[PDB]
């Protein structure tokens, strides 16, 4: 069955972009999917998206450009300690310079750059570049 | 059989014929003289074997175009033949007979045309 | 290294089927595996019908057939060239064929 819903949305995306696709319909969506789709959006990795309202759990249409090499999800959502964030981005990001680790902290779902600036930390959601 | 002409020979025959058709002939005796004029061939037996196969070709060419040989004269002949065109065949005769839908093909194409209806029955696969 | 994706001969959706006995070795092979060839032939044959038509009463008549559905295990059907090794490529063709229907003027 389903343990997580994010992992499906992310994968669906990745296969869309790999095909050469410019849109996807993910299902079923969640506040966390929105928040993650949103961080991606702010940065450029996707275009605009749209939450369609079935009387159920939702369905999202993402319009994607093609700046996206990969958006992954980290499971389980490990706790990170401010100097485990430095260790994570190195593990899974292309160059020190770019790509984001996106985690969930007490003060919001955020990319790790925003994390560093706020100076808060938490549990790791996923990534992209 | 036992005498199957080899490429060195067969090539020369295609060769000469390509650059020599209107010069060459039906008859062994003369091409053989011609090979002396138009080619330098080292032994007499080879030159004979060449003259001979190329004649077998000329005998064949002069009865129907042969699979891989072209000469200026044959090109001209095909060229002229490849003109034909009559009273012309479609007509098609007053009125096209349609299969309908093909009738509905014009009907919904904004197009007048001549007519006739005979298009019904389905319609098995295989 | 696996040779035929079909393994033996077509099962897929079973795990079992009753076995038949070769019509030559009296062997034993699953019915899914096993070369089968129908065999319909006249009671009389080639030459006979002419003496068979002349000697009989009846005005024509008009010949029964014997019908027999054969089964062979692999080794017999190979042995006797019912079927013959086909190249790594030719094996894939299920089809069947020849050019006329050999019935009197064939090989």
């Amino acid at each position: 069955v389903r343990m997580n819903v994010l992992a499906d949305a992310l994968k669906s995306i990745n296969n869309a972009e790999k095909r050469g696709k410019r849109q996807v319909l993910i299902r079923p969506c969640s506040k966390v999917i929105v928040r993650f789709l949103t961080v991606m959006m702010k940065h450029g990795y996707i275009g605009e998206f749209e939450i369609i309202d079935d009387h159920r759990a939702g369905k999202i249409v993402v319009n994607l450009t093609g700046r996206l090499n990969k958006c992954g999800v980290i499971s389980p959502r490990f706790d990170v300690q401010l100097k485990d964030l430095e260790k994570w981005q190195n593990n899974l990001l292309p160059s020190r310079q770019f790509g984001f680790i996106v985690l969930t902290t007490s003060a919001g779902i955020m990319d790790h750059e925003e994390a560093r600036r706020k100076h808060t930390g938490g549990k790791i959601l996923g990534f992209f570049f | 059989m036992g005498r199957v002409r080899t490429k060195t020979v067969k090539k020369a025959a295609r060769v000469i014929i390509e650059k020599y058709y209107t010069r060459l002939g039906n008859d062994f005796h003369t091409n053989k003289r011609v090979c002396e004029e138009i080619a330098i061939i080292p032994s007499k037996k080879l030159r004979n074997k060449i003259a001979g196969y190329v004649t077998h070709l000329m005998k064949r060419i002069q009865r129907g175009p042969v699979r891989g040989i072209s000469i200026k004269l044959q090109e001209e002949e095909r060229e002229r033949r490849d003109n034909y065109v009559p009273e012309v065949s479609a007509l098609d005769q007053e009125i096209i007979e349609v299969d309908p839908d093909t009738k509905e093909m014009l009907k919904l194409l904004d197009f007048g045309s001549l007519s006739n209806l005979q298009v019904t029955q389905p319609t098995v696969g295989m | 290294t696996k040779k035929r994706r079909n393994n033996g001969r077509a099962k897929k959706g079973r795990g079992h089927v009753q076995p038949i006995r070769c019509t030559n070795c009296a062997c034993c092979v699953p019915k899914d595996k096993a070369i089968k060839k129908f065999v319909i032939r006249n009671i009389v044959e080639a030459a006979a019908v002419r003496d068979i038509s002349e000697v009989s009463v009846f005005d024509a008549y008009v010949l029964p057939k014997l019908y027999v559905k054969l089964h062979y295990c692999v080794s017999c059907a190979i042995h006797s060239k019912v079927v013959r090794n086909r190249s790594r490529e030719a094996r894939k063709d299920r089809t069947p064929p020849p050019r006329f229907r050999p019935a009197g003027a064939a090989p």
Binding site: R19, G20, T65, G66, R67 | - | -
Partner: protein, 82 residues
């Protein structure tokens, strides 16, 4: 690809597919674009002045290059009701 003092370094900036916005990179010679002529309006008279699209090896091997051209040609004309 800036350097220290806003300078432009390494050695080239590749063209990007007209359909997928993905780098044509650089030795993939199973890919090409397509210069469409501009017309001096009115009609005929090829006047330059290319309208051009580049399509990736990928799209083409996936049995697109064509349509992509059409989304491309109509969206920017010519081509209408495609």
């Amino acid at each position: 690809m800036q350097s220290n003092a806003g300078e432009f370094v390494d050695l080239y900036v590749p063209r990007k597919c007209s359909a997928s916005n993905r780098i044509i990179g650089a030795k993939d010679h199973a890919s090409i674009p397509m210069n469409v002529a501009e017309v001096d309006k009115v009609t005929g008279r090829f006047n330059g002045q290319s309208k051009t699209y580049a399509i990736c090896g990928a799209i083409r091997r996936m049995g697109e290059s064509d349509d992509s051209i059409l989304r491309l040609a109509k969206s920017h004309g010519i081509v209408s009701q495609n």
